[PDB]
Each structure stands twice: as C-alpha cells, then as structure tokens.
Amino acid sequence: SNELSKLRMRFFSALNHTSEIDLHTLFDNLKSNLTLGSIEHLQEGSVTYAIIQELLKGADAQKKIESFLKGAIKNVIHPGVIKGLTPNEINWNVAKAYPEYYEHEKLPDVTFGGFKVRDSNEFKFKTNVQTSIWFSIKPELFMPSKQQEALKRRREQYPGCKIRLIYSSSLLNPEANRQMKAFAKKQNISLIDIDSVKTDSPLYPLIKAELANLGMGGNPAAASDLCRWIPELFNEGFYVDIDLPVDSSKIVEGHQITGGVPIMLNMGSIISEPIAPHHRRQEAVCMATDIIAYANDRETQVMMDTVALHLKNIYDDPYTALKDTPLAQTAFFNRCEEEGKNIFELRKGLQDAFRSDSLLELYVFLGPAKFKEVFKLKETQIKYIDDHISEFNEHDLLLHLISDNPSEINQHTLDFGRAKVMYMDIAKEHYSAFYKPLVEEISGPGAIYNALGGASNFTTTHRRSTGPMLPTTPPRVLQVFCDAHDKGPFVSDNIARWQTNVRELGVLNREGLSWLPSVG
Ligand SMILES: O=c1ccn([C@@H]2O[C@H](COP(=O)(O)OP(=O)(O)O[C@H]3O[C@H](CO)[C@@H](O)[C@H](O)[C@H]3O)[C@@H](O)[C@H]2O)c(=O)[nH]1
Ligand SMILES: [Mg+2]
C-alpha cells in the first residue's frame, strides 16, 4: 500500500540513503513498530542519528544499529511521540537511555517560579482549550471588528477547540452586552463575566479597581494581565492574546504537550555584547505573557499563588518595582512615593502632565534633573531656571529654552506659538517611556519575570554546541521544558527568538498601543 511506501521513503530520507548498511533489511526489521511520527526523531540533527553515525564506523554495524533502534523506538521515541514530547525532549530521553552511546552532563538544578524544573515530562497541557480577554473602554462597543474577526478565524479553522472569553458586563451598555452574548453564542464561545467571579485571590479587587478607574489611571491591559494569575479563571489550556494567529502546521494531533514546570510562558533569549572581565557574551532568557500554558495539575495552583502574592505586593507598593524606570527620576514620582499615591494616581498624574499643554506644569512634574535631560540643557542653564522658577510665567520659561537650546527645534524661534509646540513635542517623545513601565513592571511581563525569579536567575555566560541541543545549562533547560510558545500552535512577535544577538533583535516596537492613553 501507499502507507507502507510513504513510511519506507521517509525512513530512507531520515537515514541519509546510506549504503554503509542495508537500509532495506533495517527498515523491514523495524517496520512492525515504526510510524511516520517516530521517523522525525531519526533525522539528521537528532541524538538518534548521531548515535547511528558512530555505530556505522564500527564492526557489526547492521546488527548493532538494528538492536539500538528497536529499543530506542519501542522504549523512548514512540512513547514520547504519543505523549506529545518535542524533538528536544525525545533527544534528551534517548541520551539518558543510552549513556553508552551518548556522552552528556546531568540535568542542571534550575528554579522557576519556586519549583525545580523537571525532565520527567510529567506536566500535561491541553492545546485545544484557549482563553482570551477583552475589556472594552467604549461602552457602545462590545469588541472591535479586528478582535471579532480574530476569534472567528480561530473558531472556523478549529474545532473542536474550546474558546473562553473573559469580559466585563459593567463596562458595556445594555445593547453592547446583548451583542456580546449573541456573538459568543453564535461562535460557541464560553463567556466569563469578570464582574461576578467567585475567588479569594488578592488580585480580584485589583482587577476590579483597574476597570473601575478607566479614565482615572486604570488600564484594561493591566486588568487583563492580572486575570491570568487567578486559579478560578485559568486552570487548564492556554491563555492567548485575543489576536494571536494559529500556525496550523504546529497543531499536535493528540492536542497534548508536556513540560517540566506546571506553568509555561512565551520565551526567547538575548545574547549580550561582551562584558567584563573576560570579554564574554551572556545569554539572558526573556519571557512574555501573550502565551501562557497551564497544566492539569495541583502544582499549577501552587505556582500561580507565588506569582499572585508577588503581584499583590507590587500593587500595594509600586515604587520599588518602578525604581529603575524613567519616571523614577521625576519630581512627581518622588512626591507620589512620599505621599503613598497608588498606581492609578501615578498613571493619571503622568497623563495629566502631558495633556497640560504647559511647559511650567511639565517643569513641576519632571523636576530640574529630568527637565534638563529632556531639553538637553547645560547644568548652569537648569540651575538658573530652577533658582528662578517661582518667578516664571509660561513665556519666561519658553524664553530661556529658546536662548539655551534653539537647535533642538532647528532655530524656529521667531514664532513663539510654534516654538512652544515644538518644545512640547520634544517632551511628548518621552511619554511612552514614562508610561509603559506602569503596566509592564506592575502587572506585565516585567513583574512576572521578577515573580518567577528575575534576571540574575535567568542570565548565564553564553555557551554553544556541540551537536543536538540538550538541557545541560539553565537557558537550555528553560528552552526545552518551560517554553509554551515553541510547543503551542500560536504565533507571537512579542519577544526575540531563542539565542538572538542584542544588536539585531528583529522585534517591532509599535507606537500606537491600544492601552496607552492619548496625550495629543
Ligand atoms: O482596550 C483594550 C485593550 C487591551 N486589552 C487587553 O490587553 C491585551 C493586550 O492588548 P494589546 O493591544 O495586544 O497590547 P500589547 O502591548 O501588544 O500587549 C502586550 O502587553 C500587554 C500589557 O502588559 C499584555 O497584556 C499582552 O499580553 C502583551 O502582548 C488584549 O489582548 C486584551 O486582553 C483590553 O482588554 N481592552
Ligand atoms: Mg499585541
């Protein structure tokens, strides 16, 4: 039959059409327990292939290779394929099963979310259950067309995948609520209203506050970020950003993957410029939360609680989490910290300063140090301004900017109205850098990275090859066992690929984010 023909052709391709042994005899002797799925793990680049190549150089190669492959397929590869193991995971399991044929180091001790990463493949994850989140900032609009179309494109392409959607009914007017419910019914989507969830999570009040405070420093992406760490909302399948495409070629037929931790995230890594004292590059793992996988396991709730306790701590005192951000160098931040202002008041105050259309208000907000930096002033220039600021009106301050640095605005200094706009525009260049950490380091991937162990814990001296990748260093352990993006069928552009050089990240940084409030 064509099935046997297809299998045989795949096998001969995998083993490089070698004539050093008789592949017909070998194929015939293995075919009783050989599937297309297993043959992938015999290909060049695999541990199994590497072992075969060394056996070819020794005596009795025909028999030794048959004995090796029969056992490797029966005991390691085929069981791995059925369980949803990746090629990396199968390579490791083969190396472990055949220490006489493959020299390797032991699994290093790596801690991720308070848990030692395992190579047991014991945590199981469903790829056919997907949850996304949409909180509308416009009461008349349940969801924009882009997001509706994204969900349809996932539903029409795939059943029988279960699609769950968290939203807020309180954010929608009655018509929009009816439309949301109608949409979800038509698309066979399980709807979850965040307004009435039963949970004891400390994150739940914070989510409700983020949404209640829209227009007053709340943020719907921050609300969405926090939902992902409540066990009543997420306990199996994947979280995926609502608009992530599915890569059909990556769908696993058993709809199951595994990992070495009970919660996996989107990961990559960045190889640094050389650092002191040996002029060597460092590999630093990077992570994102646009794809999260949750194991069907009690340990999932345990790990999630560690992260939730960290996020609660950040919300309760955000100034530590923000200590190294641009905003931390402003007078406004220092005042807020002394006053114990909350995250909403911090975000709203920043937005207010940049909506003020006032250089004087911007000065009071930034303080002299950051005002100096933003407007590229000399120390003597900012000293004079700061000494006399209690006497200035708006025009007085503009006159000093014009005298001190007309080049910044290409000597368009004769029209004061235009000059003011140009200086305000220079300041607005920095708004995104001030604002984004107020989500990223608070509820976002910055906070989560820290919750799970922080940079130091995920950064190591860069080391390369040789041969098939094995989990024998910390970044390789995370790459093999902890990365939801590689294993899942969802497409992301949020972060660098694994082992990307810092000078060529190839990540688009978008300007008009959905969750950045405008400042004009
Ligand atoms: O009006 C909005 C806007 C955003 N969101 C939520 O926020 C998520 C991210 O919004 P997106 O426009 O994709 O922003 P990005 O900056 O591209 O998102 C990144 O940064 C966010 C904040 O940390 C994270 O929530 C995302 O997972 C991450 O991909 C969405 O999927 C929604 O869940 C809403 O619910 N309502
Ligand atoms: Mg996005």
* 358 neighbors 398 (Cβ within 8 angstroms): no
Pair 20, 97 in one domain: yes
Cβ atoms of residues 434 and 350 within 8 Å: yes
CA of 55 to the centre of ligand 1 (A): 52
Residue 439 alpha carbon, nearest atom of ligand 1 = 23
Report d(CA 128, CA 43) in Å as an integer. Answer: 28
Q: What are phi and psi of 167, to 5 degrees?
A: -145, 180
Give the other-Cβ count within 10 Å of 364's Cβ.
Answer: 16
Q: Single out the residue of 227, 162, 222, 163 nearest to residue 195, CA to CA.
A: 227
User: Which ligand is located closest to the Cα atom of residue 242?
Assistant: 1
Chain centroid to CA 179:
31
> 256 with 339, same domain?
no
| Dist. CA 512–CA 510, nearest whole Å | 6
256 and 361, same domain (yes or no): no
- Between the alpha carbon of residue 420 and those of residues 52, 79, 349, 370, 415, the distances in Å are 73, 70, 21, 18, 9
Do 97 and 152 reside in the same domain of the chain?
A: no
Q: Are residues 145 and 176 in the same domain?
A: yes
Total residue count of the chain as it appears in this document: 520
Ligand 1 test: best mutation among 211, 515, 516, most atoms within 8 Å of CB? 515
Residue located nearest, by CA, to atom 8 of ligand 1: 221
Q: 4 is written with which tokens? A: 């046997």
List Cβ neighbours of 52 (8 Å cut-off, separation of 6 or more): 15, 42, 65, 68, 69
Q: Residue 241 Cα, ligand 2 centroid: separation in angstroms?
A: 7
Return the ligand 1 atom nearest residue 443 CA.
23
Q: Which residue, among 352, 354, 359, has the nearest Cα to 409 in the 3D structure? A: 359
Whether 514 has a binding-site annotation, put simply, is: yes
Instruction: Report yes or no: 211 and 171 within 8 Å, Cβ to Cβ.
Output: yes
Residue 171 tokens, joined: 């954010």
Residue 436 and residue 398 share a domain: yes
3-state secondary structure of 242: coil
Quote the domain boundaries for residue 340. 317-440
The residue type found at 32 is: S
- The packing angle between helices 359-374 and 394-404, to 10°, is 20
154 is in an annotated binding site: no
Protein residue with its CA nearest to atom 31 in ligand 1: 241
**Ligand-binding site membership of 115 (annotated):** no
What is the resolution of the experimental data for this entry, in Å? 1.7
Q: Which atom of ligand 1 is nearest to the CA of 243?
A: 31
CA distance 399 to 168: 49
Dihedral angle over CA of 74, 79, 85, 89, nearest 10: -40
The residue whose CA is least distant from atom 29 of ligand 1 is: 290
Q: Which atom of ligand 1 is nearest to the CA of 134?
A: 35
CA 214 to chain centre: 25
CA of 515 to the centre of ligand 1 (A): 7
The C-alpha angle with vertex 185 and arms to 179 and 190, in degrees rounded to 5, equals 105
- Quote the ligand 1 centre to 519 CA distance (angstroms): 19
Which among 71, 87, 107 is the end of a domain?
107
What letter represents residue 187's amino acid? Answer: Q
- Judge whether 365 is annotated as a binding position: no
Same domain? 182 vs 291: yes
> What's 265-325 look like in SS3?
EEEEEEECCCECCCCECEEEEEEEEEEEEECCCHHHHHHHHHHHHHHHHHHHCHHHHCCCC
- This entry's atomic model was obtained through X-ray
512 Cα: distance to centroid of ligand 1 (angstroms): 12
Count Cβ atoms within 10 A of the Cβ of residue 352 and give its class: 0-12 exposed, 13-18 middle, 19 or more buried.
middle
For the beta carbon of residue 310, count every other beta carbon within 10 angstroms. Answer: 18
Point out the domain boundary residue: 46, 72, 107: 107
CA of 266 to the centre of ligand 2 (A): 13
For helices 343-355 and 359-374, give the axis angle rounded to 10 degrees.
100
Hey, which of 165, 241, 438 would you mutate to test ligand 1's pocket, going by the most ligand atoms within 8 Å of its Cβ?
Answer: 241
Are the CB atoms for 70 and 30 separated by under 8 Å?
A: yes
Report the C-alpha gap between 262 and 119 in whole angstroms: 12
Written as six digits, the tokens of 470 are: 């094995």
Residue 228 counted as an annotated binding residue: yes
Determine the angle formed by the axes of helices 61-72 and 47-55, rounding to 10 degrees.
160
Nearest CA to ligand 1 atom 19: 290
Say how far apart CA 226 and CA 205 lie, in whole Å: 10
Question: What is the spatial distance between Cα 479 and Cα 486, in angstroms, rounded to a whole number?
Answer: 8
Atom of ligand 1 nearest to the CA of 445: 23
Ligand 1 neighbours by CB, cut-off 6 Å: 133-135, 137, 220-221, 224-225, 241-242, 289-290, 439-440, 444, 494, 513-515
| Domain co-membership, 242 together with 334 | no
Going by alpha carbons, the residue nearest to atom 27 of ligand 1 is 290
Specify whether 217 is located in the same domain as 279: yes
Chain Cα centroid distance, residue 131: 16
Specify the long-range contacts of residues 443-448, CB closer than 8 Å, at least 24 apart: 443/221, 443/222, 443/225, 443/226, 443/311, 443/314, 444/221, 444/222, 444/225, 444/289, 445/287, 445/288, 445/289, 445/494, 446/321, 447/225, 447/310, 447/311, 447/314, 447/321, 448/265, 448/287, 448/289, 448/307
Q: How far is ligand 2, taken at its centre, from the CA of residue 517, in Å?
A: 16
494 is in an annotated binding site: yes
Q: Same structural domain for residues 143 and 94?
A: no
CATH code of 35's domain: 1.10.1740.130
Q: What is the spatial distance between Cα 280 and Cα 293, in angstroms, rounded to a whole number? A: 34
Say if residue 145 is exposed, middle or buried (CB neighbours under 10 Å; 0-12, 13-18, 19+): exposed
Tell which atom from ligand 1 comes closest to the C-alpha of 137: 1
Question: If DSSP codes are grouped into helix, strand and coil, which group holds residue 172?
Answer: coil
Using DSSP's 3-state secondary structure scheme, residue 124 falls into: strand
Q: Which two tokens stand for residue 245?
A: 């495409």
Alpha carbon of 432 to those of 226, 228, 519: distances in Å? 21, 24, 10
Please list, in sequence order, all residues whose beta carbon lies within 8 angstroms of the beta carbon of residue 363, skipping any fewer than 6 positions away: 371, 385, 389, 397
Is 486 annotated in a binding site? The answer is: no
Between strands 263-271 and 500-501, the pairing is: parallel
Q: What is the whole-number distance in angstroms between the Cα of residue 79 and the centre of ligand 1?
A: 39
Structure token digits, residue 23: 């592949």
Alpha-carbon distance values, 108 to 40, 118, 264, 464, 478 (Å): 27, 10, 18, 16, 11
Tokens standing for 172?
Answer: 């929608």
> Which ligand approaches the C-alpha of residue 512 most closely?
1
Q: Which of 345, 322, 312 is nearest to 213 (CA)?
A: 345
Question: Do the beta carbons of residue 259 and residue 235 sit within 8 Å?
Answer: no
Q: Are 304 and 231 in contact (CB under 8 A)?
A: yes
Ligand nearest to the CA of 495: 1
Instruction: Single out the residue of 517, 519, 12, 419 nearest to residue 214, CA to CA.
Output: 517
Half-sphere exposure of 198 (CA within 13 A, CB side): 0
Round to whole Å and give the CA distance between 54 and 77.
19
Query: Cβ of 427: how many Cβ atoms within 10 Å?
Result: 20
Kindly give the residue spans of alpha helices, DSSP state H, lying in 482-516: 484-487
The answer on 425 and 382 residing in a single domain is yes
3-state secondary structure of 159: coil
Q: Do 486 and 291 form a contact (C-beta atoms < 8 A)?
A: no
Q: Are 161 and 129 in contact (CB under 8 A)?
A: yes
Tell me: do 357 and 420 sit in the same domain: yes
Q: Which ligand is nearest to the CA of 221?
A: 1
| Number of domains within the chain | 3
Locate 180 and state its tokens. Answer: 């949301």
Domain boundary among 75, 107, 139: 107
Which ligand number lies closest to the CA of residue 515?
1
